[PDB]
Structures are given as C-alpha cells and as structure tokens.
Amino acid sequence: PYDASKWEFPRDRLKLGKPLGRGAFGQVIEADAFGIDKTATCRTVAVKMLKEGATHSEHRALMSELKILIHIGHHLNVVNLLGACTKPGGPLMVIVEFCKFGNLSTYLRSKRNEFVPYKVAPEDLYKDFLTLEHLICYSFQVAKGMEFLASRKCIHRDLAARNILLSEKNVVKICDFGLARDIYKDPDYVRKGDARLPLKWMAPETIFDRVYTIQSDVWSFGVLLWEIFSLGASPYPGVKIDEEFCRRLKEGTRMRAPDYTTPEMYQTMLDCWHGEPSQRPTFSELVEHLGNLLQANA
Ligand SMILES: CCn1cc(CC(=O)Nc2ccc(Oc3ncnc4cc(OC)c(OC)cc34)cc2)cn1
Incomplete structure (x- = not known):
C-alpha cells in the first residue's frame, strides 16, 4: 500500500x-x-x-x-x-x-593501513585508527539489521559489504542498490545463463537449486564477515570462479582465515558456511554471540 x-x-x-x-x-x-x-x-x-x-x-x-x-x-x-x-x-x-562514508567494502580497503588490533596508551588514543572493536561492532550491527528484516518476513538476496553503508558515529546500514549499480560492468557479478549473479556470496542450494531463504542470507553474512576481517579484500583470492569452484564448494571446500581475524570470528564464518541450511545459526543467535564477543573484546 x-x-x-x-x-x-x-x-x-x-x-x-x-x-x-x-x-x-x-x-x-x-x-x-x-x-x-x-x-x-x-x-x-x-x-x-x-x-x-x-x-x-x-x-x-x-x-x-x-x-x-x-x-x-x-x-x-x-x-x-x-x-x-x-x-x-x-x-x-x-x-x-x-550515509556520508559510502559503502563498507570501499571504506575498509582505503583505511587498511590505519588499523591496530588494540589501542595502546597514550599515543594511539587521539589517532583515529580502526580496531578489532570497530570490526566486531560493524558485524554485530549488520546481524541486528538482518534479524529485524527476518522479523518483517523479508530476505535480502544480495547481502555483501558493497551493500552496507557507513554513517556518522560508527552506525552501519543495510541497503540494496539494485539497478543503481552497474552489475554488467562489476566483476562481483558473474554471467550465469541469461543473468548476472553474485556467485562468491551465494550458498550451494542457491547456486545449484535456485533456493533463496533467510538461511542462504546467513551464508552470505559469513562471506561479509570475511570481507570485514580482511579489511575489504575480494573473496576466494586466486580462485577461478567456474564449474570446479561450484563443485568444490558443494563438497565442503571453504575459505582460509583472513589476515585481521581472531579464532572465534573465523569459527563464526565456518558455522555460517555449514553445508546444511538448517544447521547454520539464525540471525537472533548471531546477535547473541557477537554481543558477547564485543563484551569480551572490551
Ligand atoms: C535492505 C533494505 N532495503 C533498502 C532498499 C532500498 C535502498 O537501499 N535504496 C538505496 C540504496 C543505496 C543508496 O545509496 C546511498 N544511500 C545513502 N547514502 C549514500 C552515500 C553515498 O556516498 C557517500 C553513496 O555513494 C554511492 C550512495 C548512497 C540509495 C538508495 C531495499 N531494501
């Protein structure tokens, strides 16, 4: 209406x-x-x-x-x-x-050098560095936004760092550019039949069976967590996105841990990438788990 x-x-x-x-x-x-x-x-x-x-x-x-x-x-x-x-x-x-700082993928990449895992007193205090606290904070905010979208009986279908915008006071926002993004020029979208699809972010049941659910959005969230803790790198580096890639993913081949992750954040990525959709955590579970990591990080 x-x-x-x-x-x-x-x-x-x-x-x-x-x-x-x-x-x-x-x-x-x-x-x-x-x-x-x-x-x-x-x-x-x-x-x-x-x-x-x-x-x-x-x-x-x-x-x-x-x-x-x-x-x-x-x-x-x-x-x-x-x-x-x-x-x-x-x-x-x-x-x-x-949202004055634009998309999260571009932002994190441009600020890759201005990162320290923890601020060590007193010099680091007045320098505007990105830290592990910031990264876990952005992750927790996206899980909250996705839990809200699930509660309204909606599914995203194109969840990625390029569809996260950064506003003032460290607030991040889920968006969807749609055809306001040139998907025909963009390397993140691959030609599959008559369509251009985000293959690197798609769950196996989505690639092979064309099945879109809130649990395939959980798989894409796992990919988004890898983009945050790699500070804006492109998923599956060096891997040719073809038939062999899809076959290996269907058999249980997963990404290696990014450069700026902690063991528990990488274990969260693996759980999001469970082969069985019902065995992946829910967005409500992710909010609980990330909130606890943010309290442990303090
Ligand atoms: C998941 C819920 N949902 C939301 C929709 C609609 C929707 O998201 N529309 C949309 C998406 C992105 C937009 O772009 C920007 N918006 C704000 N600020 C920006 C700032 C920018 O640069 C400093 C910038 O640069 C490229 C782009 C900016 C505008 C409208 C559908 N479902």
Missing part, C-alpha cells in the same frame, strides 16, 4: 546535486530537501531514480521497492525511507537517509 498523505514530498522542495556512483538503469543522486523530517529544516539526502534506457519494467520495480520500504518500517541498521515523489509530470524518486 502507498499512504500518500504521509510519504509524498513536493518536487519543488528537493534540490538535486551530484550523482553518487555509476548505475545501469538506475542512479543515486545527492540532494538537499527542505523540511522532509523536521519542520522547515534543510537536510542532505540520497535520491534513487531511473535514467535514460530504463523502461516501464524498471519503473514497476522501483515502485515495488518503495512499497517494500513502507512495509518494513524503520530500524537503526537499515537505510530508512524519508519520502517519495510519485505524482504525474515528473520521474519516480525514492528518498532515503544520506
């Missing part, structure tokens, strides 16, 4: 700026909205819209994303809906909260 009296924002109160990243049939644009959340207050926002080449099919898909966002509602660890421009005479525009 679309509740207009609430979500409809006037096009003349939105000031479009520079494009953020590159898309195929969609585009994300930085903008400044007047009084979208607080009365008569300017606010920087991100706007998702279509571009030249898009058809009626992509327009239906963008409207579906807006309806899903209305249904889900807000949570701290999900990129939240602020409003929309749906009225005739202009393009469909979906307005969300702005």
Whole structure:
C-alpha cells in the first residue's frame, strides 16, 4: 500500500546535486530537501531514480521497492525511507537517509593501513585508527539489521559489504542498490545463463537449486564477515570462479582465515558456511554471540 498523505514530498522542495556512483538503469543522486523530517529544516539526502534506457519494467520495480520500504518500517541498521515523489509530470524518486562514508567494502580497503588490533596508551588514543572493536561492532550491527528484516518476513538476496553503508558515529546500514549499480560492468557479478549473479556470496542450494531463504542470507553474512576481517579484500583470492569452484564448494571446500581475524570470528564464518541450511545459526543467535564477543573484546 502507498499512504500518500504521509510519504509524498513536493518536487519543488528537493534540490538535486551530484550523482553518487555509476548505475545501469538506475542512479543515486545527492540532494538537499527542505523540511522532509523536521519542520522547515534543510537536510542532505540520497535520491534513487531511473535514467535514460530504463523502461516501464524498471519503473514497476522501483515502485515495488518503495512499497517494500513502507512495509518494513524503520530500524537503526537499515537505510530508512524519508519520502517519495510519485505524482504525474515528473520521474519516480525514492528518498532515503544520506550515509556520508559510502559503502563498507570501499571504506575498509582505503583505511587498511590505519588499523591496530588494540589501542595502546597514550599515543594511539587521539589517532583515529580502526580496531578489532570497530570490526566486531560493524558485524554485530549488520546481524541486528538482518534479524529485524527476518522479523518483517523479508530476505535480502544480495547481502555483501558493497551493500552496507557507513554513517556518522560508527552506525552501519543495510541497503540494496539494485539497478543503481552497474552489475554488467562489476566483476562481483558473474554471467550465469541469461543473468548476472553474485556467485562468491551465494550458498550451494542457491547456486545449484535456485533456493533463496533467510538461511542462504546467513551464508552470505559469513562471506561479509570475511570481507570485514580482511579489511575489504575480494573473496576466494586466486580462485577461478567456474564449474570446479561450484563443485568444490558443494563438497565442503571453504575459505582460509583472513589476515585481521581472531579464532572465534573465523569459527563464526565456518558455522555460517555449514553445508546444511538448517544447521547454520539464525540471525537472533548471531546477535547473541557477537554481543558477547564485543563484551569480551572490551
Ligand atoms: C535492505 C533494505 N532495503 C533498502 C532498499 C532500498 C535502498 O537501499 N535504496 C538505496 C540504496 C543505496 C543508496 O545509496 C546511498 N544511500 C545513502 N547514502 C549514500 C552515500 C553515498 O556516498 C557517500 C553513496 O555513494 C554511492 C550512495 C548512497 C540509495 C538508495 C531495499 N531494501
């Protein structure tokens, strides 16, 4: 359902700026909205819209994303809906909260050198280094966001560090770029039949049986944990993503531990990658386990 009296924002109160990243049939644009959340207050926002080449099919898909966002509602660890421009005479525009540091994969990679496992007093205190505490904290926040999405009877289907945005005060948010990411140019997406799929993040029942469940999102979460504790490296380094790769994964071949992990975080990755989906932990279990590691790390 679309509740207009609430979500409809006037096009003349939105000031479009520079494009953020590159898309195929969609585009994300930085903008400044007047009084979208607080009365008569300017606010920087991100706007998702279509571009030249898009058809009626992509327009239906963008409207579906807006309806899903209305249904889900807000949570701290999900990129939240602020409003929309749906009225005739202009393009469909979906307005969300702005996350100033961008996606997590790019962020962690750019800051790989500015990392220390623990801050040793007094010099490290005033230096803005990334630590094990930060990494376990981002991991725990994504598990909380995913537990919330499961509670609303939703499944992600493209969970990865490139679909995590970093906001102020170390808050991370789950998102979905959709066709606002150029998946035809992006090496993370592999051609399989008539489609471009994220093979390195997909569970065996997803690759071989086309089965998508909350437990195959748990498998992708295990991959996301590897990307965080490798500080933005690409999964399965040196491995050719072909028929042999899929065969080995189906027989129990798994990734070796990343460079910045602790033994218990690598053991969490292995559990997420259990061959049997029912034997993988739930998102509620992951929240419990990560919370305890964050208390042990302190
Ligand atoms: C899982 C729940 N769910 C959410 C949806 C819709 C959705 O996530 N839409 C979406 C996704 C990404 C967007 O992009 C950005 N948003 C905020 N800030 C950004 C900041 C950026 O750079 C500093 C930037 O650079 C590339 C991109 C930014 C905008 C809208 C569907 N399901």
